[PDB]
């Protein structure tokens, strides 16, 4: 992973250190997130049933041009190497009740 | 791992499931239920003594 | 009286890997770095705090 | 509302329905459909099938066999108790959630719209009973009342 | 709210979504990368019980109409329901349909017994408040039992 | 009549906790000149009776104890440890807290017997894939890592056009967890092209899609099923 052209160091990008501009591949077109992936890392407290801080690093490619299209946005977005899926399909839930 | 472990191979399907798709259909479900219920009365007296 | 209750949902879903293949925070494994390997449970209650 | 894109989607969803279909938001949901289509049927194939270009690939495969049919026996809903409205049963690791017939709703499917009005009671499968001891032709047999 | 500004909302959380609905595995499960990951994996298990033990509901004394009360530290606030208030939702009046009565509450479970023959048990009570005036069984088990650690 | 001149009483108290009870109210209807004129015998409820509880009476988990320890995995060494679900929580009970599976380090008895792929003519990946080595230098992304294509300083053909994938067609590659109903993992790489443009039209207006390898075949008519 090093000289990727990705940060594959969480925090400190040392991988991408002091590396050549002939090293660093063009190894994916692109690399948005999906739009809230972040998220999907946070711990959460069952008990006050708030998210809490971020435990999982959620946008580690692995050297990956791991593409999904979503329809719903309508572009291009660059999954994580791990995540297992992560899909875009919508369902709308709706309850009414007037009195 | 190469030796049967069945923990290790259920992770397989709590990640991946068991089956996949040979084939199928995709689009959209539209489901509705409204309900409206009313009620009203009236009450005129008049009485000249 | 109204109620309305109300969800739009589009991210279907995300599903995380397993333990083994995901990738901790940097900060995160920093904490469980310092953790004391002892029950030290003012530590660990710090943990689960942040 | 499943498919769609959100915008659309949600006009049609926050339609009261006091008369019925929307023709223009349902159209426009309808195209939005076309961009982001969700799963509406399907054929299944096992997952083992798919085991097929690795190292040790036969052994893993048969392994995962062995593993689905354990698998199965352990967590199957047939374990569950039924759901009310013949609502399916289905086993999310270890708590069963209820899949609603059309016309019932609520978390379990408690409750009923006014149209379902039928009250027949559909015969989920029970759990297969352990295989009998080998007949006498050799073959072992395994039967699931049904009730 | 008007029928447009629902729809561009709904836009809207196309690209800003908040995590809605979660199935959770518990947080010990991923220590790891680290020296004694093994251990602290299990130090982390215990730590994870002491703390829903600290901050367990069942400390709180109930709240009328249907109040959760919640530990906040050291201290319970009643989250009344709505149009309800007060220390205890003692006052206003519960809007919408209620089922009534006052529905029971968990005691804290009692110390485990030091899994004596390795099985360790301990009870609750449902005391906290005891079900009355036709409202619900407290849900759940009354006692729990575990291999010893 | 104008029948709120006879309050009802409150609600009874639920006849069950957990199973779909009954509760009532009826009117404090005092007989008087105003009811017997104004013919609120004829048109008033005077007691009026509603669900309550309907939710479905909660089923609390029980789980077995744990088997023994797995035989040390000599490839892993975690031997596992398991126990079952005696019956699952539903209808709102208590979860299955505890872990349903246990793992433990272990020193394994025994060594490792896996193989190298070594798939012999066919491109081997960084990620171990074997590719079929018309692939290698394919102008595309078939191992993901680029491997492929990491040295290839000509590269085959890439069609005339960065055609868009089908709507969703990523969904048609998730596993599907048949005990639960609900989709799972990503299982098959739609994304994966095999170096050919096969190409559908959803319509003669659209730009065409561009149909991966691991689909035969795909239908854009519209059905009101
Ligand atoms: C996907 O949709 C296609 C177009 O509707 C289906 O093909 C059609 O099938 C009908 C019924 O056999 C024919 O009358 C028609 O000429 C056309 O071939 C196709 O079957 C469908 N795919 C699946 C798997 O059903």
């Known amino acids: 992973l090093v000289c990727n052209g990705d940060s594959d160091c969480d925090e400190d990008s040392a991988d991408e250190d002091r590396c050549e501009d002939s090293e660093r591949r063009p190894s994916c077109d692109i690399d948005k997130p999906p739009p809230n992936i972040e998220l999907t890392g946070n711990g959460y407290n069952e008990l006050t049933g708030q998210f809490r801080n971020r435990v999982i690093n959620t946008k580690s490619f692995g050297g990956q041009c791991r593409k999904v299209f979503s329809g719903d946005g309508k572009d291009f977005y660059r999954l994580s190497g791990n995540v297992l899926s992560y899909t875009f399909q919508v369902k709308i839930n709706n309850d009414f009740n007037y009195e | 791992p190469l030796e049967y472990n069945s923990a290790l191979y259920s992770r397989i399907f709590d990640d991946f499931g068991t089956h996949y798709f040979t084939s199928g259909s995709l689009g959209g479900v539209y489901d509705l239920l409204y309900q409206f219920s009313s009620e009203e009365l009236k009450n005129s007296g008049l009485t000249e003594e | 009286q109204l109620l309305v209750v109300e969800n739009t949902v589009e991210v ?36 689960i705090d942040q | 509302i499943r498919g769609g894109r959100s915008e659309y989607g949600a006009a049609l969803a926050w339609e009261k329905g006091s008369s019925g279909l929307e023709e223009k938001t349902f159209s426009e949901w309808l195209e939005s459909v076309k961009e982001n289509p969700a799963v509406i ?8 099938d798919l085991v097929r270009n690795i190292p040790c690939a036969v052994t893993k495969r048969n392994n995962l066999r062995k593993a689905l049919q354990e698998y199965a026996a352990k967590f199957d809903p047939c374990q569950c108790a039924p759901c009310p409205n013949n609502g399916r049963p289905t086993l999310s690791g270890t708590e069963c959630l209820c899949v609603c017939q059309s016309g019932t709703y609520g978390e379990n499917c408690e409750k009923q719209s006014p149209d379902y009005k039928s009250n027949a009671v559909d015969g989920q499968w029970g759990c297969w009973s352990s295989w009998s001891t080998c007949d006498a032709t050799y073959k072992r047999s395994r039967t699931r009342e049904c009730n | 709210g008007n029928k447009r500004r629902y729809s561009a909302w709904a836009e809207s959380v196309t690209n800003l979504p908040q995590v809605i609905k979660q199935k959770l595995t518990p947080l010990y499960e991923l220590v790891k990368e ?38 906040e530290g050291t201290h319970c606030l009643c989250h009344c329901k709505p149009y309800t208030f007060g220390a205890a939702c003692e006052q206003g009046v519960l809007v919408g349909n209620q089922a009534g009565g006052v529905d029971g509450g968990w005691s804290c479970w009692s110390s485990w017994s030091p899994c004596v023959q390795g099985k360790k048990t301990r009870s609750r009570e449902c005391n906290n408040p005891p079900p009355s005036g036709g409202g619900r069984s407290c849900v759940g088990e009354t006692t729990e039992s575990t291999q010893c650690e | ?151 290839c300083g000509r590269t085959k053909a890439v069609c005339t056009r960065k055609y868009n994938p089908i709507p969703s067609v990523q969904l048609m590659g998730n596993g599907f967890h048949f005990l639960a109903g609900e989709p799972r993992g990503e299982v098959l790489d739609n994304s994966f092209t095999g170096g050919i443009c096969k190409t559908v039209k959803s319509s003669r207006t659209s730009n065409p899609y561009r149909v991966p390898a691991n689909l035969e075949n795909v239908g854009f008519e519209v059905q009101t099923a």
Do not use: M
Request: proline fraction near 6%; aromatic fraction near 10%.
């Open chain 3, 12 to 47: 279907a879903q995300f599903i995380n890997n397993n333990p083994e293949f995901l990738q901790l925070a940097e900060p995160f494994w920093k904490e469980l770095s310092h953790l004391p390997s002892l029950y030290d449970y003012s530590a660990y209650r710090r943990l």
């Open chain 6, 1 to 151: 009549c104008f029948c709120d001149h006879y309050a009802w009483t409150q609600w009874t108290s639920c006849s069950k906790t957990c199973n779909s009870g009954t509760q009532s109210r009826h009117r404090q209807i005092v007989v008087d000149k105003y009811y017997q004129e104004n013919f609120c015998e004829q048109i008033c409820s005077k007691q009026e009776t509603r669900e309550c509880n309907w939710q479905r009476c909660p089923i609390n988990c029980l789980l077995g104890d744990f088997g023994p320890w797995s035989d040390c995995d000599p490839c892993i060494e975690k031997q596992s440890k398991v126990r079952s679900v005696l019956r699952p929580s539903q209808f709102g009970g208590q979860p299955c807290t505890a872990p349903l599976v246990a793992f433990q380090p272990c020193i394994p008895s025994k060594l490792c017997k896996i193989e190298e792929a070594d798939c012999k003519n066919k491109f081997r990946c960084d990620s171990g894939r074997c590719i079929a080595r018309k692939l290698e230098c394919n102008g595309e992304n078939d191992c993901g890592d680029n491997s492929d294509e990491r040295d």
């Open chain 5, 34 to 71: 680290v020296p004694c990951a093994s251990v602290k994996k299990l130090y982390l298990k215990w730590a994870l019980e002491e703390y829903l033990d600290e901050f367990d509901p069942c400390h709180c004394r109930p709240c009328q109409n249907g109040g959760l009360a919640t530990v």
């Open chain 4, 41 to 48: 049927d399907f054929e299944l194939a096992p997952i083992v």
